[PDB]
Design a protein around this ligand. Structure first.
Ligand SMILES: O=C(N[C@H](CO)[C@H](O)c1ccc([N+](=O)[O-])cc1)C(Cl)Cl
Ligand SMILES: O=C(N[C@H](CO)[C@H](O)c1ccc([N+](=O)[O-])cc1)C(Cl)Cl
Ligand SMILES: O=C(N[C@H](CO)[C@H](O)c1ccc([N+](=O)[O-])cc1)C(Cl)Cl
Ligand SMILES: O=C(N[C@H](CO)[C@H](O)c1ccc([N+](=O)[O-])cc1)C(Cl)Cl
Ligand SMILES: O=C(N[C@H](CO)[C@H](O)c1ccc([N+](=O)[O-])cc1)C(Cl)Cl
Ligand SMILES: O=C(N[C@H](CO)[C@H](O)c1ccc([N+](=O)[O-])cc1)C(Cl)Cl
Ligand SMILES: O=C(N[C@H](CO)[C@H](O)c1ccc([N+](=O)[O-])cc1)C(Cl)Cl
Ligand SMILES: O=C(N[C@H](CO)[C@H](O)c1ccc([N+](=O)[O-])cc1)C(Cl)Cl
Lengths: 178, 178, 178, 178
């Protein structure tokens, strides 16, 4: 029953990265963190200008093509492989495809023990934080705030609308089996 | 009565930068933002290793020497000069010297119309956010949370302990005379 | 004859920022660094989406409107004011307007002692570095490589095409009167 | 004979990251990039303050403990797993242990087709660039410039002392079998 992977899902500006660093500080054993964002940074820059890659609409929409998806797949497998190799992994994701996305993960994970975490946050509030951070495309927060969880099943749910990252971290750590 | 400068004061991780970007988005006229941090980034790197410069204790303490202070002074004058030249300026500061610090500003400002803003936040909560951001020296938040406001007089006060940046932004904008 | 300001001019990716940090390390007295880029970061984000602000064409072109120019002006005056106040200032600029730009500076500077530095670099090579850094809009380097110096007069010229930043730094420092 | 992984080795400031982005732009197929630095960013912050983790001496030295090494191991396996899954991977490493380090990789890689790249650069020059970038601990460049290659065998060697990143990129791409 030892937890091997902690997969978090939430919309942009919902507070995931903040929760991730807190978890890494709180949890006693070292946990590696990776996510759709670190994956993007690891993909070639041109992937962001290629049709079957990832595209950022000016209104904050996000489109994903097969070239991008294909790469992501091998990446996912590698992350699972790290867990298998004995590294405790935290995944900061954004299930744009809702349930479809969670399934995709389930397939790569297999019988590996995973803690599915849901990070919610009022769209309006997320949108406010989006402005405050100033480093995201205005509109992503709102567009993602809800559709991301539709049909997704979690083992734990935190809502950053009125809870600090460190607090949400404590709630999540409590469900982590050593 | 037109506001020329908005000087914010608060401890590390209290939420100032977030409020600043919100203000820049909210306010109709363009406001330039500068602060102790941009000043630091503009000072030579070695200033951070020189005795009369700025020193960061491992426990999160911050010491300021005369070499640093001298530079800061000319900088302050320049910022005031920008206001005088007609640029709307926002200053994100950290009054380590409490009232002493506010006086220092008053001297540079003169009869220029300034909106003194206080950004408060529970030390414990600030410390939590400090961990979540992971890019500050652990301990700064708590050490600064309160001593920074002792003896300081504001025209407006916001407390980020339970208020989003955008909200605090709205409260502050309301006191800005066009 | 003491040098109060060091104004560098060069196209994107020509190597200015690198030379700037070297100068700050080399020069014995503390020099504050500021530039078109720090100014941009200090301007509201929306300035980048407003017509009379600054616009970044997808091919790497850069357009500047009056709203942006107006702000820049007050900023320039403030920087000069810092020099006057006794702070040694380094300005990392990009004379898009060639000679016109240098004149604009001359007007703000007045009789202040300034060291005009020219940072050149082969367009092709600059374009290569542009790719290597991956954090600029492809095409800026080439578009700026030359037009930026047309009609501009320097006291010192360095060419980073075959010279390291630290070397160019040494050449520039040598012309700085204490 | 299709190349699955490109493993680059070089000392800090030798120019690897710059070469990596160029390769990602040059190579026709998408290549994911990862390295000791992205791994560090993915490890908990505290790993940098824990004895068996990674420690940064003030003079630029770097020490690695077993806790850090253990994690790195599972990470290495995961990266190899990504290659196996069909993702083209580029690894930006720093063989502090010289030959010992290359062996460690050979063990994880197995019979996977790998292109071993060596990125050299004169210590003095690397040290100069270290200053110019200003975001590394002074002294790392020099300490690493040479010891890193002792006993290491490459399929290709580039020297950034007098060659631009894009050029070195071209030399390396030429040895990549599709
Ligand atoms: O802005 C970014 N990422 C955010 C999420 O952190 C963006 O909203 C996003 C959402 C989903 C996504 N995906 O699922 O492939 C990619 C980017 C990075 Cl490009 Cl910096
Ligand atoms: O190289 C490109 N495109 C082709 C299709 O025109 C290609 O198959 C591709 C798309 C994205 C990509 N990536 O992320 O590196 C790589 C190759 C464009 Cl990005 Cl210029
Ligand atoms: O960490 C930093 N700054 C914070 C404040 O944002 C630090 O707490 C600090 C506080 C006061 C200060 N001062 O008043 O000179 C300088 C740095 C910068 Cl060095 Cl990145
Ligand atoms: O140059 C240095 N120090 C002397 C005193 O030893 C000097 O007067 C000084 C201190 C800080 C500084 N700065 O911020 O650039 C500049 C010069 C050290 Cl930083 Cl190496
Ligand atoms: O990319 C940027 N700046 C470069 C120069 O460093 C861009 O080429 C540029 C050039 C000139 C300019 N101007 O003169 O107003 C503004 C940006 C910043 Cl937006 Cl990050
Ligand atoms: O606020 C805006 N525009 C008007 C004109 O429609 C305005 O006068 C302005 C433009 C740029 C700007 N800035 O940089 O903050 C401020 C106000 C747009 Cl940026 Cl939404
Ligand atoms: O400074 C850093 N990394 C450089 C290399 O890019 C440092 O020189 C270093 C070298 C070797 C290393 N290792 O082999 O574990 C880790 C960091 C990161 Cl901590 Cl930002
Ligand atoms: O938690 C810590 N240490 C113990 C040993 O005292 C621990 O086993 C450990 C070290 C590094 C680490 N990491 O990278 O997350 C995790 C746990 C210190 Cl970092 Cl406070």
């Amino acid at each position: 029953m030892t937890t091997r992977m902690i997969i978090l899902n939430g919309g942009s500006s919902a507070g995931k990265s903040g929760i991730v660093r807190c978890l890494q500080s709180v949890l006693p054993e070292p946990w590696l963190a990776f996510g759709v964002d670190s994956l993007i940074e690891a993909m070639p820059l041109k992937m962001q200008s290629a049709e079957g890659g990832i595209e950022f609409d000016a209104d904050g929409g996000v489109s994903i093509g097969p070239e991008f998806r294909a790469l992501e797949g091998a990446w996912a497998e590698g992350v699972v492989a790290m867990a298998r190799a004995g590294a405790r992994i935290i995944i900061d994701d954004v299930f744009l495809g809702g349930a479809a996305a969670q399934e995709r993960w389930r397939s790569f994970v297999g019988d590996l023990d995973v803690l599915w975490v849901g990070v919610r946050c009022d769209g309006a509030v997320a949108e406010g934080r989006e402005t405050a951070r100033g480093d995201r495309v205005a509109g992503m927060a709102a567009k993602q705030a809800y559709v991301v969880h539709e049909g997704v099943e979690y083992d734990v749910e935190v809502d950053t609308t009125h809870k600090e990252s460190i607090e949400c971290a404590w709630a999540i750590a409590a469900h982590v089996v050593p």
